[PDB]
Amino acid sequence: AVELEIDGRSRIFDIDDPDLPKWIDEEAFRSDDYPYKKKLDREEYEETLTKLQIELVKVQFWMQATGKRVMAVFEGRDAAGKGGAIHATTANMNPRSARVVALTKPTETERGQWYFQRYVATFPTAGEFVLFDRSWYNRAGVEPVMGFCTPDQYEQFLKEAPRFEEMIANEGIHLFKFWINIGREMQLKRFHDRRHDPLKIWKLSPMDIAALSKWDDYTGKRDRMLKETHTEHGPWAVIRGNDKRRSRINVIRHMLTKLDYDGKDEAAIGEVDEKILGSGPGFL
Amino acid sequence: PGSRAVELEIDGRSRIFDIDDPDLPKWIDEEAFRSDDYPYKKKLDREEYEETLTKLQIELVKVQFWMQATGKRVMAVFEGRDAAGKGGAIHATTANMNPRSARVVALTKPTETERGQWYFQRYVATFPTAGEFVLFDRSWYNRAGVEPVMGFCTPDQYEQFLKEAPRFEEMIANEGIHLFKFWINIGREMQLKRFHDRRHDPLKIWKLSPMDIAALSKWDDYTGKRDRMLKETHTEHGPWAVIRGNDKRRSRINVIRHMLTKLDYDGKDEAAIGEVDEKILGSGPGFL
Amino acid sequence: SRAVELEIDGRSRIFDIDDPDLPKWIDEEAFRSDDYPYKKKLDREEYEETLTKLQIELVKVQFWMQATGKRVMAVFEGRDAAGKGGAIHATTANMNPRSARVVALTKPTETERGQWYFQRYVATFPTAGEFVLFDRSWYNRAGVEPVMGFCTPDQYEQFLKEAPRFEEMIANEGIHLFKFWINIGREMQLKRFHDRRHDPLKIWKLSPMDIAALSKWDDYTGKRDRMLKETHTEHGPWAVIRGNDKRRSRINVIRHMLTKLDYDGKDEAAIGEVDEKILGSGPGFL
Amino acid sequence: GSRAVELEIDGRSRIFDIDDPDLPKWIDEEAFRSDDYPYKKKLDREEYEETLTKLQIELVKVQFWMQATGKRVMAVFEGRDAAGKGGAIHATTANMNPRSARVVALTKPTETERGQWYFQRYVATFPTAGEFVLFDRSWYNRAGVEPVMGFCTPDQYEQFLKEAPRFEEMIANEGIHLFKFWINIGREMQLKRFHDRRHDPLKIWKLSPMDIAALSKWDDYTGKRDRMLKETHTEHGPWAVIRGNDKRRSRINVIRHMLTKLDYDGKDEAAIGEVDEKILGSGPGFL
């Protein structure tokens, strides 16, 4: 079990415990000042998603004609729900043009290269929607927190990421960056859900469990990054992710509003929820 | 419309199929499921399917762990007719697998450089490293079906492919990589029904191309190329598993059970695997 | 039947490349064309001697690079027949081909064409220790591509604006980027073309395109100056070489590189001095 | 004498000291004629350059011919350390268009590559239409350096001798023309060229501590050579074996064999000359 300190109070969390203790279970949803008291009605979420998806088919037909290229980054804490936001957007997309980049950790050869090199290799050709599991922003989160990269390297990445993204925007590739937020209790509940589901247990490693008393360590790095890497060229979208249903819908609503695609049905997109989707610093 | 309407011979019987017409004619709609001597009258129960699938996927988590521990490498090839259900079979396999060790290879048309290479060069480029599970959406068997039928390869290149594929697969087997090859069959009416489902679902419409619709009359040619491919390339080192795929639930379940049965993985639970259904999964030519 | 009509600095001549008689006005002017600073070609024995000392320092550079993990890219651009390849071979002849490699990319595929222009060049960037020389670089879009209409004037003007940003990131990373422009005089090009035509070890180096593009000399002069102007920056400076004499061209390319590399075991006496009459910086030299 | 070493030069004990800039006469005077080299002296350099020039003009034809037919060629060069592989390659490629004649110089296997099929990283380098691909080191590092040095397992080395013929059958079935050259030198000759390398500042990087130590492992490598030529010399993959003591004669006859075997358009059989059977032989038993 892990000794913690949740907003002033010292707490005891056993992940191998098949029982979720009261202060996680009852707190998880509202954690981190989540704006809503319960989950989105499911029927209503599913019928919204279908509509958003039918839109995303319009997008991809338009992408194939204009040759328009789109890139989509998803970052967040462990279990913030990057993958479910990714699978929501691509589930009913053509995997020929919409592809998910899942890069393993750098090889030796990749380590002596320009950090951005292996990301460049995955960049879109005419018409491609490229989505990122892990992005070049491991250098602004996991790597300096875990000391997988030097301070100087992290510091260079913060400096180089906007020059990198100016190049992308100047090329006319449309980059989205989504930071997905969850409250501390949610992470714990989700971590626990993974542990006790034989279908999701491979997602945990002892490291992820060791790095639970590194919340603030990660809070620090999050805030540095968003201020320092949110440019006009590369804006950051920040999502409240406690409810995955709301997180998915607003991710897709945001992208749809931002892309000037043929056959765009504004009634079907609806309103990006101001309570859920923000911009850069000042939102969290 | 009636604008893309086409005449078809459905088992020595003439018929017109209009894909843009949102009404599905009874000669398809009522005949789809049992078409081509399908051994069951109804679709596998939805909730039973999901229950069995979950058990099977837990076993796949055991396979993945065993593969990492041992460096073991697997390759799975999925072929069949258009809309046969190759992608759902793959997705059912990898839905709850680690994507950094189970990856899907989906290669696009050959570039100029590639056409001048050895046919297999660009597939070797995707081969597994240790612990990797590689699934092919379209494989090298593109030259055994789609390429000759449409004239994308010469008759000589086809003949040459049928000769070379066994040899290539022997290299794969001697290297210690486990290759599976799945042929997923559906009945003619079921293809049509699926084509129709696709046209009239705005989520699936993109699955249909012009090419797809014209190739509907080329059904008997595909049967020949199919039969000749199974005949020539079913070998000891590279067996064809042949799936009756009218019911996608029984198809996905039996694809996975077969793989689990042939893999000698750690923590294997035969009771959770269950029994491969011999009415659904058969072997090489003659099953079909 | 392949004879071209040309205008050499306010004077009209015809050039038949397939006539083995090199006319006087080429033969007598090839060498000193374009205000070349020297009376004659550098003697062979002295060239070979000096090149040896230079390739020995290149061995020291390689060993330092393997040790410090240092990374170098060397870009070579010029008119046709300038001697880009000769200068690359002079550099790499006595270096380990497993840490010093040459990049010679062919025309872009359908896929590479729909991509970031710089994507396929980034694929070829060095890992630790590596020296990468470019046969044709991203500067084909600041040379052949707009002149020959292979890229749009919008794509050309986009490249001119984007290449210093590219080179900024290269420099920021600490990959040392060398760019050489190899200048030749007009009459020297004609001789070299004719040399290639009438020598069977060299005839494949020609195209009917290169011969057609002889009339395009002044247009190419235009794109040269434009490029050296826009894309000569602090993080990516252009070195300009007078290449009429291939021997002095090669020696100074290497001299420039050794001078700028702060490697262990370096011997200034062995490098000697860069010939300011052969090697200039940026525009305002030609 | 800090890296000096004792050797059994044909049952006769001997001390070689590489870092001594003076070459002992038992090497210097014996190198050229080692391993019963059929000739007394070096091929005259001008005659060599004149011959090479003609061979290279024939190689321009090959290239034009390959581009028009799409014909593909691979050339593998193996031999002991310092046998002369890079030299045979550069004599081939010096006046060829590098846009279609490429030299493959593969570094050690990465970790990813080690868990792949042995041949996968080499298939990645295979020719497209009209390409001529030359290999500095090839897949035959599993037949030689790897077993001897323990970089691969006995099982992997055995695996390799079995698979290489199959691989080469696929290459031949595909219509790609594979040449395989083994370049032999005498023991004394190797030592001389090692010494040349050590004491030439242009060449010293070609020498490694590993290479010096493996000078005792001569007989070891002899065994691997003979066994590899035995198991992998087949009809679809013949080994051409070159006596390479003279680098000029080796380069010339490597090139003549290739010319001789390619039925290229413009072929001037008189310009090719005759392959010297004292220098080039085939498969096992030649040496």
PDB file of C-alpha atoms in Angstrom, chain A residues 50 53-54 57 60 92-96 102-104 133-134 198-199 202, chain B residues 54 57-58 61 96-100 106-108 137-138 202-203 205-206:
ATOM      1  CA  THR A  50     -22.818   8.776 -33.387  1.00  0.00           C
ATOM      2  CA  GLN A  53     -18.787  10.342 -35.794  1.00  0.00           C
ATOM      3  CA  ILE A  54     -21.010  10.883 -38.873  1.00  0.00           C
ATOM      4  CA  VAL A  57     -16.660  10.691 -41.789  1.00  0.00           C
ATOM      5  CA  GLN A  60     -12.186  12.385 -43.758  1.00  0.00           C
ATOM      6  CA  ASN A  92     -15.743   4.686 -37.206  1.00  0.00           C
ATOM      7  CA  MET A  93     -12.928   6.256 -39.257  1.00  0.00           C
ATOM      8  CA  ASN A  94     -11.047   4.727 -42.148  1.00  0.00           C
ATOM      9  CA  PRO A  95      -7.837   3.278 -40.688  1.00  0.00           C
ATOM     10  CA  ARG A  96      -6.209   3.808 -44.083  1.00  0.00           C
ATOM     11  CA  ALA A 102       2.176   4.038 -30.655  1.00  0.00           C
ATOM     12  CA  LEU A 103       5.941   4.604 -30.312  1.00  0.00           C
ATOM     13  CA  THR A 104       7.884   2.459 -27.841  1.00  0.00           C
ATOM     14  CA  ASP A 133      -0.735   7.846 -27.993  1.00  0.00           C
ATOM     15  CA  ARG A 134       2.523   9.195 -26.646  1.00  0.00           C
ATOM     16  CA  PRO A 198      -7.752  -9.091 -16.071  1.00  0.00           C
ATOM     17  CA  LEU A 199      -8.354  -7.270 -19.416  1.00  0.00           C
ATOM     18  CA  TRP A 202      -1.202  -5.099 -18.364  1.00  0.00           C
TER      19      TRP A 202
ATOM     20  CA  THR B  54     -14.044 -11.750 -22.726  1.00  0.00           C
ATOM     21  CA  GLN B  57      -9.215 -12.060 -24.484  1.00  0.00           C
ATOM     22  CA  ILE B  58      -8.083 -12.764 -20.926  1.00  0.00           C
ATOM     23  CA  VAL B  61      -3.375 -11.369 -22.143  1.00  0.00           C
ATOM     24  CA  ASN B  96      -7.564  -5.620 -25.227  1.00  0.00           C
ATOM     25  CA  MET B  97      -4.000  -6.305 -26.198  1.00  0.00           C
ATOM     26  CA  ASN B  98      -0.995  -4.047 -25.664  1.00  0.00           C
ATOM     27  CA  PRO B  99      -0.635  -2.040 -28.963  1.00  0.00           C
ATOM     28  CA  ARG B 100       3.158  -1.804 -28.531  1.00  0.00           C
ATOM     29  CA  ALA B 106      -2.104  -2.335 -43.277  1.00  0.00           C
ATOM     30  CA  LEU B 107      -0.021  -1.680 -46.386  1.00  0.00           C
ATOM     31  CA  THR B 108      -1.181   0.599 -49.226  1.00  0.00           C
ATOM     32  CA  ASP B 137      -5.061  -6.622 -42.697  1.00  0.00           C
ATOM     33  CA  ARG B 138      -3.982  -7.126 -46.288  1.00  0.00           C
ATOM     34  CA  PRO B 202     -23.441   6.895 -42.657  1.00  0.00           C
ATOM     35  CA  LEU B 203     -20.830   5.429 -40.290  1.00  0.00           C
ATOM     36  CA  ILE B 205     -20.477   4.196 -46.178  1.00  0.00           C
ATOM     37  CA  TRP B 206     -16.738   4.823 -46.634  1.00  0.00           C
TER      38      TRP B 206
END
